[PDB]
């Protein structure tokens, strides 16, 4: 079956090179073409280029001589390389399996890439537990605050995923060079504190992970 996974840096400084790898599974790069599409934070899709089967490459006129696409059939990978970077290049990068015209077109999960001078910094994870004695009820909402990181993105799950129902993870808001996000989870009063509730935060750009169990105030 088809599988495309892109691997990139996460944070790259302006005027530096950017290299993203797209590893494919279940098909030959010699039979299908592979293009690159980007999407700036909260904006539309921008086609960057494509590497065809016969090996021919085509790029978007916008980034004429700044972008290059190549591949290694042995390694079963395609690479996007960009130089003379601009902060506008900050975006989610996707590789997609395409054909001349027809069925197949399947995209990868994409990778986030930010072009900036800011230095990458890991997040601080604070537990958001209830008022203690201010409001009992059937439902109870716990939280997890993630602040002070750079760059995006950050990942949050509750109880390593076993708890995904009634979860609300809010988008990050840039707060002066650093990012802040929060996630809430609502559960029955029967579970917490009885059964345990932990949020798991992952910040790949800093190769960090934090588990914070939510304990009664």
């Amino acid at each position: 079956e088809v599988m495309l996974v892109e691997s990139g840096p996460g944070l790259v400084a302006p005027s530096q090179s950017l290299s993203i790898t797209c590893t494919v599974s279940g098909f030959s790069l010699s039979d299908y073409g592979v293009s690159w599409i980007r999407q700036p934070p909260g904006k539309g899709l921008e086609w960057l280029g494509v590497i065809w089967g016969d090996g021919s490459t085509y790029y978007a006129s916008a980034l004429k001589f700044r972008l290059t696409i190549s591949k290694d059939s042995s390694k079963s990978q395609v690479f996007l390389n960009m130089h003379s970077l601009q902060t506008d290049d900050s975006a989610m990068y996707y590789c997609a399996k395409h054909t001349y015209g027809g069925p197949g077109d399947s995209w990868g999960q994409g990778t986030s890439v930010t072009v900036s001078s800011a230095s990458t910094t890991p997040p601080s994870v604070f537990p958001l537990a209830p008022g203690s004695a201010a409001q009992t009820n059937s439902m109870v909402t716990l939280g997890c605050l993630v602040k002070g990181y750079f760059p995006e993105p950050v990942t949050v799950t509750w109880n390593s995923g076993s708890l995904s129902s009634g979860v609300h993870t809010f988008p990050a808001v840039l707060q002066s060079d650093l990012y802040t996000l929060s996630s809430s989870v609502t559960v029955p009063s029967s579970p917490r504190p009885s059964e345990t509730v932990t949020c798991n935060v992952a910040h790949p750009a800093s190769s960090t992970k934090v588990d914070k169990k939510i304990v009664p105030r």
């Binding site: 921008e46 086609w47 209830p130 609300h168 929060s182 809430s184």
Partner: protein, 217 residues
């Protein structure tokens, strides 16, 4: 270069209804040789990567439901969903493939449902955040509707404007509601000088805004 102008920007509809969006290309996308129009429609659900719904202006991809229908030729095309369901919540894009792929600005399809009052939760700063000199008070407003809701923070009865960051989750495609996070960021210094901390959620759903608050002591 080919420019794709899409419309409408955003559409609001009730489950079961029907809607259409148009895509107009700066030039004909009809290829005389293959007698084909190179235009496709992509669906991007909140948080996932785009998925092609239709290729060659009117050919549903493998697995796409019948309610999705595309048409047009030359410079004018349109997409239609027979009975817009909940899972249809997403942003729709059209891509022309006559010359160097280009994407439309996109069409944001949202769902309409009945007014719903938010479930509000207030969280004082955590013991461990305090120890670092920071003091965030968090307020969660969950599962409400419509989107436009306001949040006012009141420190000791005085409305504070500085240090508030707000985040709205994409529309939940299950209950069609929204959720938002409100964070009042203060220094441990100013936080410990005041005592009453409140979060007010005034919304259409109620003449009297929903209030939740606490006191440090």
């Amino acid at each position: 270069d080919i420019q794709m102008t899409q419309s409408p920007s955003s559409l609001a509809v009730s489950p079961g209804e029907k809607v259409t969006m148009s895509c107009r290309s700066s030039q004909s996308l009809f290829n005389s040789r293959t007698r084909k129009n190179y235009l496709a429609w992509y669906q991007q659900k909140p948080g996932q990567s785009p998925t092609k719904l239709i290729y060659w202006a009117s050919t549903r991809e493998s697995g796409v439901p019948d309610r999705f229908t595309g048409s047009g030729s030359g410079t004018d095309f349109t997409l239609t969903i027979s009975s817009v369901q909940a899972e249809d919540l997403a942003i729709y894009y059209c891509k022309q493939s006559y010359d160097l792929p280009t994407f439309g600005a996109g069409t944001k399809l949202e769902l309409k449902r009945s007014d719903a009052a938010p479930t509000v939760s207030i969280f004082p700063p955590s013991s461990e955040q305090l120890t670092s000199g920071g003091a965030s008070v968090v307020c969660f407003l969950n599962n409400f509707y419509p989107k436009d809701i306001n949040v006012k923070w009141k420190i000791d009865g005085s409305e504070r404007q500085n240090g508030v960051l707000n985040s709205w989750t994409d529309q939940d495609s299950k209950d069609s509601t929204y959720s938002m996070s409100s964070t009042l960021t203060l220094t441990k210094d100013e936080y410990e000088r005041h005592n009453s901390y409140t979060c007010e959620a005034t919304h259409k759903t109620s003449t009297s805004p929903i209030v939740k608050s606490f006191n440090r002591n």
